Amino acid sequence: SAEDKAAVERSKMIEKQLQKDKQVYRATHRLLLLGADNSGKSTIVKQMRIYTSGIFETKFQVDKVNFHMFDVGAQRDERRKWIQCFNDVTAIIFVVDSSDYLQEALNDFKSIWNNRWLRTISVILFLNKQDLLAEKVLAGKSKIEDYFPEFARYTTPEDATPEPGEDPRVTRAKYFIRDEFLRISTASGDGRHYCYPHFTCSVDTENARRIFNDCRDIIQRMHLRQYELL
Amino acid sequence: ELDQLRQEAEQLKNQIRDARKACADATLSQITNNIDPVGRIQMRTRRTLRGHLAKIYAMHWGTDSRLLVSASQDGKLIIWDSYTTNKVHAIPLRSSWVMTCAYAPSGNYVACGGLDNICSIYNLKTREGNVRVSRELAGHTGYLSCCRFLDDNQIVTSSGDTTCALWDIETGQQTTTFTGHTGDVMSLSLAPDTRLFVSGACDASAKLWDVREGMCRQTFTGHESDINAICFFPNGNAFATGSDDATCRLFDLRADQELMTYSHDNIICGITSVSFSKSGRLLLAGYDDFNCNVWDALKADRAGVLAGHDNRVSCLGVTDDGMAVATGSWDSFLKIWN
Amino acid sequence: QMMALTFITYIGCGLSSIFLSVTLVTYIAFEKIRRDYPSKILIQLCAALLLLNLIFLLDSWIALYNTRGFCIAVAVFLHYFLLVSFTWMGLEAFHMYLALVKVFNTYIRKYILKFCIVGWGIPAVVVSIVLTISPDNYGIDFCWINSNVVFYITVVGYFCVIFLLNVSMFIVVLVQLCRIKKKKQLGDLRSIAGLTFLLGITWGFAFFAWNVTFMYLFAIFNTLQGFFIFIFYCAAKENVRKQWR
Amino acid sequence: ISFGILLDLSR
Amino acid sequence: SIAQARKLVEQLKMEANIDRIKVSKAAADLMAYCEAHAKEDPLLTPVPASENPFR
Amino acid sequence: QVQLQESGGGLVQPGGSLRLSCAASGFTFSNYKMNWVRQAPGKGLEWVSDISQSGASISYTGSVKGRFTISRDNAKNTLYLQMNSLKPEDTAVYYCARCPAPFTRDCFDVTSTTYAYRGQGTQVTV
Amino acid sequence: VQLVESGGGLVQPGRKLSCSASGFAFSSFGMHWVRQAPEKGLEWVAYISSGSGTIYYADTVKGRFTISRDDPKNTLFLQMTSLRSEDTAMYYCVRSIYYYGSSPFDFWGQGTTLTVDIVMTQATSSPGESVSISCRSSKSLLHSNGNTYLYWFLQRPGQSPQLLIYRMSNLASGVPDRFSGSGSGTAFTLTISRLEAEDVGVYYCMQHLEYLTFGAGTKL
């Protein structure tokens, strides 16, 4: 008809708008912020925003590249069904308090990594509060051998990168928590999805860069999986 | 004392169990054997609704059965003129992650609900052309997972905080709160007698609630995993749930227990979505293996295969005249099936 | 030497056409494969390769029975289809630029069609500006460009550009997988072996044959380039076999 | 003819 | 929590007090509704294109 | 109906042997991954162990990595937890956190404050 | 929602008409121009679609009229090069939108008095009586989609008309429930269950099979 013709043309109009918003969706790389209500999940929001709602959209443009980062607060502690809403994101940023003893966050990482829908979703992993870890394992008040007996037989690896001025016990502890997450990471998803363990504080302004330089490799990895190069 | 009431609750659950067993003199699979099957339905794709940007996590049909609302996780709500495949009223959203949409039985209103703890009600038939906000139904402490419009000014919303909620869209405040579940609640459906709804949650127990009386009438603990899917039998006297356990089950309302299992040993993948085509002779249970399986809900066998998606089917609904089946999926497309 | 060498091109291109027509059917009819941009750009690259091999072979069927009206079209369609194969491998490396070097902001509105107006349109306009200055550029044992200058400027120089953006990106993918395997956490030959044919890195075997054995290697690999895309990018991907069975 | 007519580098 | 237990047992006390019809007389209504709507089902039989609005 | 009746607990000395059974009803026990999760006083829910649908994939928390052992019989419809030696700090109640979905290797929500598929709890007091 | 246009004025025989719109998202609307001659039924002039996509005319103003919008500034212009004696008419822009269950032609602009196909013919040139207004078409208006495209219009003496019935499957918003349309393809009757005060106006009909005659109208 003609209102069928005008409705098809209006729909062409709808799509014209869907393509103009698909420019700002497909060039937008979605991040899912998760924690265990003890990490620096909130202070990461309070530092890269300045460079009862159940989702928080933070829009940060790093290297003239837009990023929507989705903080899940004001939701319940059950995760398994709203987590399925984030298997088309670019990254899941699992922020872990590496000083708070941790295995609860390791099971959260086990759940995210081995989720049937997030198995194509590679996790950016932030070992945040490394300052609290540095003031914890140097003090010796709380040890990780009590909370992890394989830390007694753990040695620091040769590809580890210690900071200038960082104590060897701090490096061994922080890379032990990293390797605790990569026991999960290198178990189920080998090249399908790949974890990105780095070390975070509440002071470093390199966090948006560290997100950009990781999501670069994330969407490179899924692009190489599109040719089955990985 | 906690333990004495807990033991009283367990003894009363056993009382409900052997009351259900005493009224299960012969199950529905036993008595429905003389009826011939429908057969191998070569149901196919009629319409491919392409244009959603992200994974299509929910949809709903209408009473006019030509326009369907579809909510995908991009941040867009698209009405689809399904007879001509037209994108009616695709609108930008306050929340990028929308997990549900309903379509009003008159057709004016839709319900964007998702991660945001907000069921924002959007009026399609305005004097405005942009589908402006009626109001944001805020107040939930969990994600809005399903919604179903009672009327234009009345909606029940499934939320991921153990509570469903009957709202009042002319006021914006919760008319009543349905707090009987122990797990977060996924799925919702209204009966032809619209005052009586049923809701499924992640504690393997769908409960039948009253809209006007305001709280729980019936409890159904027949599943064994997290109920993603619920719909009434189209008389408003029974209802089917699908969950993560690769076993759809149909329950009654005049009986308190399970009528049937729908689980092929070969299905080791859960169910997200169910709907009914004016009869329980045919039930659609969209599964996690990227395709929808049609179960004859009177003989409990796979009547059909809807293999038209390269991603998981997250929302399947039948028109209210029974004409079509729109299965929206995680491939960002809805396939329409006949 | 001459006839044995041409044997691989016929047998190689015959097998490539046989296993590339079924590749185009199993890609166009099975919609589920072409969700991502690499599959769609690979479909139109395989269409370029199929209409290069079939016309190329055709340009040899009418080589024995040559008609001037027909030679020019076949020579031009063989030139047009050679340059759409080269331009689709150049746009293949440019898709790898937008996916692996200019990694973010990879969306362009109707990406495959704006690559269709370049992968086919730019060869169409450069063949057109060959034709508007001289139509005798195509003719004569086989119908190819019979203008050495045009051949260098349009086939070779142009091919070299497609090669100097193709091995400028093949080494990028190899160092990216080198970076991936050198990022060892807690301490595939088929993929690279198909990537060296899909980007036309062996199409630069003629540079080393500028020697008699690289004529054989060049001809042998480019006559079966579509066959190797079938066995490394159609028969190797599990989703295509899932759609097959 | 062989495939190597197209890219005859010296010709 | 004991308040959740009190709420659950108060909801659950009337759960056994409902009138439950046996399956031979309650799920026979499903046969009654399907055989009253088998002809009104547009998806059991393959509906031809004259009155099917989808192709 | 998913009912997870734990048996065990009571007053024992630190270091004693105490099997922690879990009578499972309402689900096909062989098709599900299984967890054990404890709740100590003054803390939240804390995970103990996870075992797969079969006996292959077994994981522990490092508090109990050396002193606990876990068994499972699929035919008996029962989860087990044989405790060899008890420390003072796990004076909690072990909630059999049944896993949300079957044939999946991820166990969300077993440590939630209000999670569905846990038992009614048995206090293992040391 | 309000439409006001300032284009019309004194004009020698032989001007742009901005239709400044407000209260809605103007970019998504089919915008018509409809001119009713003094003491005559409104005739349709032109139509520009949503997003300026498809543009139609009355096949008598094609070679001399042109139309355009300006969407960020939220207005529309009707550039009008040649003005013969036919265009001694008051111009009105009917706002309209086209989808399923939509309400095209619901609100009309206030007007500009300018001084210098399927043929609809009503059966009548000119209380509480149940009156039926008749309308005749030159072909069957029941299309294969299932929608019979006729649009009813009630005009007060001295202000813009408004939609009564769209496609005879549902009624408009501003119309009361007293109006009901019916038809079979050629004869087209609109009945009033309870005729009321201020309901006196001229009644127009429109087809949307092809491009848009109106008829002379029935005065009451």
mmCIF file with all atom_site columns, N, CA, C and O in Angstrom, chain F residues 59-73:
data_model
loop_
_atom_site.group_PDB
_atom_site.id
_atom_site.type_symbol
_atom_site.label_atom_id
_atom_site.label_alt_id
_atom_site.label_comp_id
_atom_site.label_asym_id
_atom_site.label_entity_id
_atom_site.label_seq_id
_atom_site.pdbx_PDB_ins_code
_atom_site.Cartn_x
_atom_site.Cartn_y
_atom_site.Cartn_z
_atom_site.occupancy
_atom_site.B_iso_or_equiv
_atom_site.pdbx_formal_charge
_atom_site.auth_seq_id
_atom_site.auth_comp_id
_atom_site.auth_asym_id
_atom_site.auth_atom_id
_atom_site.pdbx_PDB_model_num
ATOM 1  N N  . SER F 1 59 ? 38.164 -28.735 43.900 1.00 0.00 ? 59 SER F N  1
ATOM 2  C CA . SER F 1 59 ? 38.852 -27.529 44.336 1.00 0.00 ? 59 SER F CA 1
ATOM 3  C C  . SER F 1 59 ? 38.506 -27.243 45.790 1.00 0.00 ? 59 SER F C  1
ATOM 4  O O  . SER F 1 59 ? 37.392 -27.517 46.243 1.00 0.00 ? 59 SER F O  1
ATOM 5  N N  . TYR F 1 60 ? 39.465 -26.652 46.506 1.00 0.00 ? 60 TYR F N  1
ATOM 6  C CA . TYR F 1 60 ? 39.339 -26.391 47.932 1.00 0.00 ? 60 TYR F CA 1
ATOM 7  C C  . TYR F 1 60 ? 39.673 -24.930 48.181 1.00 0.00 ? 60 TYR F C  1
ATOM 8  O O  . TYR F 1 60 ? 40.344 -24.285 47.371 1.00 0.00 ? 60 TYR F O  1
ATOM 9  N N  . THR F 1 61 ? 39.197 -24.396 49.303 1.00 0.00 ? 61 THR F N  1
ATOM 10 C CA . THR F 1 61 ? 39.786 -23.161 49.797 1.00 0.00 ? 61 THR F CA 1
ATOM 11 C C  . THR F 1 61 ? 41.057 -23.488 50.567 1.00 0.00 ? 61 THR F C  1
ATOM 12 O O  . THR F 1 61 ? 41.226 -24.593 51.090 1.00 0.00 ? 61 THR F O  1
ATOM 13 N N  . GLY F 1 62 ? 41.974 -22.524 50.602 1.00 0.00 ? 62 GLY F N  1
ATOM 14 C CA . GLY F 1 62 ? 43.270 -22.775 51.198 1.00 0.00 ? 62 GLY F CA 1
ATOM 15 C C  . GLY F 1 62 ? 43.266 -22.857 52.708 1.00 0.00 ? 62 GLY F C  1
ATOM 16 O O  . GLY F 1 62 ? 44.275 -23.269 53.291 1.00 0.00 ? 62 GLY F O  1
ATOM 17 N N  . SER F 1 63 ? 42.168 -22.465 53.355 1.00 0.00 ? 63 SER F N  1
ATOM 18 C CA . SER F 1 63 ? 42.042 -22.712 54.784 1.00 0.00 ? 63 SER F CA 1
ATOM 19 C C  . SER F 1 63 ? 41.924 -24.200 55.081 1.00 0.00 ? 63 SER F C  1
ATOM 20 O O  . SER F 1 63 ? 42.403 -24.660 56.123 1.00 0.00 ? 63 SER F O  1
ATOM 21 N N  . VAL F 1 64 ? 41.310 -24.968 54.178 1.00 0.00 ? 64 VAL F N  1
ATOM 22 C CA . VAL F 1 64 ? 41.041 -26.378 54.417 1.00 0.00 ? 64 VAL F CA 1
ATOM 23 C C  . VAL F 1 64 ? 41.674 -27.269 53.354 1.00 0.00 ? 64 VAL F C  1
ATOM 24 O O  . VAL F 1 64 ? 41.314 -28.445 53.242 1.00 0.00 ? 64 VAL F O  1
ATOM 25 N N  . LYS F 1 65 ? 42.626 -26.728 52.580 1.00 0.00 ? 65 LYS F N  1
ATOM 26 C CA . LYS F 1 65 ? 43.217 -27.431 51.439 1.00 0.00 ? 65 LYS F CA 1
ATOM 27 C C  . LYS F 1 65 ? 43.951 -28.703 51.851 1.00 0.00 ? 65 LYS F C  1
ATOM 28 O O  . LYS F 1 65 ? 43.962 -29.685 51.098 1.00 0.00 ? 65 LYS F O  1
ATOM 29 N N  . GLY F 1 66 ? 44.528 -28.726 53.047 1.00 0.00 ? 66 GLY F N  1
ATOM 30 C CA . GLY F 1 66 ? 45.239 -29.904 53.496 1.00 0.00 ? 66 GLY F CA 1
ATOM 31 C C  . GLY F 1 66 ? 44.483 -30.776 54.479 1.00 0.00 ? 66 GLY F C  1
ATOM 32 O O  . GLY F 1 66 ? 44.746 -31.979 54.567 1.00 0.00 ? 66 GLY F O  1
ATOM 33 N N  . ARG F 1 67 ? 43.540 -30.194 55.221 1.00 0.00 ? 67 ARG F N  1
ATOM 34 C CA . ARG F 1 67 ? 42.914 -30.898 56.332 1.00 0.00 ? 67 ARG F CA 1
ATOM 35 C C  . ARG F 1 67 ? 41.525 -31.441 56.022 1.00 0.00 ? 67 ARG F C  1
ATOM 36 O O  . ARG F 1 67 ? 40.967 -32.163 56.852 1.00 0.00 ? 67 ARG F O  1
ATOM 37 N N  . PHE F 1 68 ? 40.946 -31.109 54.874 1.00 0.00 ? 68 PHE F N  1
ATOM 38 C CA . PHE F 1 68 ? 39.616 -31.582 54.519 1.00 0.00 ? 68 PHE F CA 1
ATOM 39 C C  . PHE F 1 68 ? 39.715 -32.548 53.346 1.00 0.00 ? 68 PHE F C  1
ATOM 40 O O  . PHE F 1 68 ? 40.620 -32.447 52.512 1.00 0.00 ? 68 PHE F O  1
ATOM 41 N N  . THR F 1 69 ? 38.785 -33.498 53.294 1.00 0.00 ? 69 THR F N  1
ATOM 42 C CA . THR F 1 69 ? 38.619 -34.327 52.110 1.00 0.00 ? 69 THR F CA 1
ATOM 43 C C  . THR F 1 69 ? 37.134 -34.479 51.817 1.00 0.00 ? 69 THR F C  1
ATOM 44 O O  . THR F 1 69 ? 36.298 -34.432 52.723 1.00 0.00 ? 69 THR F O  1
ATOM 45 N N  . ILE F 1 70 ? 36.807 -34.603 50.536 1.00 0.00 ? 70 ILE F N  1
ATOM 46 C CA . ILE F 1 70 ? 35.429 -34.578 50.063 1.00 0.00 ? 70 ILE F CA 1
ATOM 47 C C  . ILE F 1 70 ? 35.164 -35.818 49.214 1.00 0.00 ? 70 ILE F C  1
ATOM 48 O O  . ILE F 1 70 ? 36.011 -36.229 48.412 1.00 0.00 ? 70 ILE F O  1
ATOM 49 N N  . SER F 1 71 ? 34.022 -36.455 49.454 1.00 0.00 ? 71 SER F N  1
ATOM 50 C CA . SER F 1 71 ? 33.569 -37.600 48.684 1.00 0.00 ? 71 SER F CA 1
ATOM 51 C C  . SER F 1 71 ? 32.183 -37.314 48.123 1.00 0.00 ? 71 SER F C  1
ATOM 52 O O  . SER F 1 71 ? 31.511 -36.358 48.522 1.00 0.00 ? 71 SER F O  1
ATOM 53 N N  . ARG F 1 72 ? 31.758 -38.159 47.184 1.00 0.00 ? 72 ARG F N  1
ATOM 54 C CA . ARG F 1 72 ? 30.462 -37.996 46.538 1.00 0.00 ? 72 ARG F CA 1
ATOM 55 C C  . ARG F 1 72 ? 30.034 -39.323 45.933 1.00 0.00 ? 72 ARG F C  1
ATOM 56 O O  . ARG F 1 72 ? 30.807 -39.950 45.203 1.00 0.00 ? 72 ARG F O  1
ATOM 57 N N  . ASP F 1 73 ? 28.811 -39.746 46.239 1.00 0.00 ? 73 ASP F N  1
ATOM 58 C CA . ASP F 1 73 ? 28.203 -40.912 45.614 1.00 0.00 ? 73 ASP F CA 1
ATOM 59 C C  . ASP F 1 73 ? 26.985 -40.450 44.830 1.00 0.00 ? 73 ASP F C  1
ATOM 60 O O  . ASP F 1 73 ? 26.037 -39.908 45.410 1.00 0.00 ? 73 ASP F O  1
#
